[PDB]
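Review session, final week

We close the course with one last complete record, chosen because it touches almost every idea we covered. It is Ubiquitin-like protein 4A, a protein from Homo sapiens with 81 residues. Go through it on your own first, then we will talk.
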Amino acid sequence: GSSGSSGMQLTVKALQGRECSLQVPEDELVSTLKQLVSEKLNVPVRQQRLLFKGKALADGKRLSDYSIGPNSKLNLVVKPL
């Protein structure tokens, strides 16, 4: 497979922590957008949490619904499990 023309690039960065990029579409479900990274940093979705412009995403909705296009930098947060 090849990324670029189709889909978008998302770079998740944790507050003064770690980060990582991933290839996902524009209508990607927040539920999958998280599970994907969970494998990258080997962190459970239960802990790590994504944030956009101070907006809490719900596992299920689509980034497109939040008005988030390509080249979007998501914010990662650590929560106590």
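Two points worth writing down before the exam:
The chain has one helix and five strands.
The helical segments are 30-40.
Good luck, everyone.
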